[PDB]
Amino acid sequence: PLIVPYNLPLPGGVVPRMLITILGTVKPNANRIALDFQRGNDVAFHFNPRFNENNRRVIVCNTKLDNNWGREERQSVFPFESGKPFKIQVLVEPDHFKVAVNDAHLLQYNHRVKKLNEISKLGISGDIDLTSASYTMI
Numbered sequence: 001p002l003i004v005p006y007n008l009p010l011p012g013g014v015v016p017r018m019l020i021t022i023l024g025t026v027k028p029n030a031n032r033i034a035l036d037f038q039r040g041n042d043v044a045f046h047f048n049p050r051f052n053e054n055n056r057r058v059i060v061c062n063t064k065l066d067n068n069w070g071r072e073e074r075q076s077v078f079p080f081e082s083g084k085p086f087k088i089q090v091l092v093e094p095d096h097f098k099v100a101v102n103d104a105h106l107l108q109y110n111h112r113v114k115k116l117n118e119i120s121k122l123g124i125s126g127d128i129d130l131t132s133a134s135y136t137m138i
């Protein structure tokens with residue numbers, strides 16, 4: 001087991017063809033999960049499953065610049081379930097992050113922060129037991 005919140009360093013930043021894989025289990029009665037790809041204090045890509053936002057399950061994605069959140073991108077496809085094991089894969093492509101959950105494409109998030117090699121850490125937080133967090137080049 002890994003302790004949450006967990007920081008995964010991304011040495012030399014992200015780059016196209018880098019694949020990040022996160023394995024864990026959603027806690028029973030979970031409320032939220034978050035992945036935060038950080039450029040210093042900025043959050044280049046925040047991926048935030050919300051299990052009960054006005055009795056709806058939604059994934060909210062955004063960017064934080066100078067401590068301000070931007071325009072939300074929302075996805076109603078919601079592949080996570082309380083109590084159950086998941087796999088998140090984030091593939092860096094030239095123009096977006098591509099996210100798959102449990103081997104099924106979920107969403108893409110266009111790069112707003114364009115200095116990819118300065119996005120040097122991934123934070124993993126929220127209502128999970130974390131099994132593994134790693135990266136490889138494809």
Ligand SMILES: Cn1nc([C@@H]2O[C@H](CO)[C@H](O)[C@H](n3cc(-c4ccc(Br)c(F)c4F)nn3)[C@H]2O)n(-c2cc(Cl)ccc2C(F)(F)F)c1=S
Pocket residue numbers: 032033034046048060061062069070072125126127
């Ligand atoms: C309903 N709601 N949600 C938000 C913010 O909406 C953002 C996305 O647009 C982020 O999700 C942010 N957030 C979430 C977490 C967070 C932490 C700990 C774990 Br553990 C974990 F899983 C996590 F998601 N930290 N910051 C969240 O607080 N805000 C919000 C709140 C403030 Cl004070 C200012 C601006 C906003 C808004 F502009 F974005 F809307 C509202 S109101």
Ligand SMILES: [Cl-]
Pocket residue numbers: 032048050
């Ligand atoms: Cl939240």
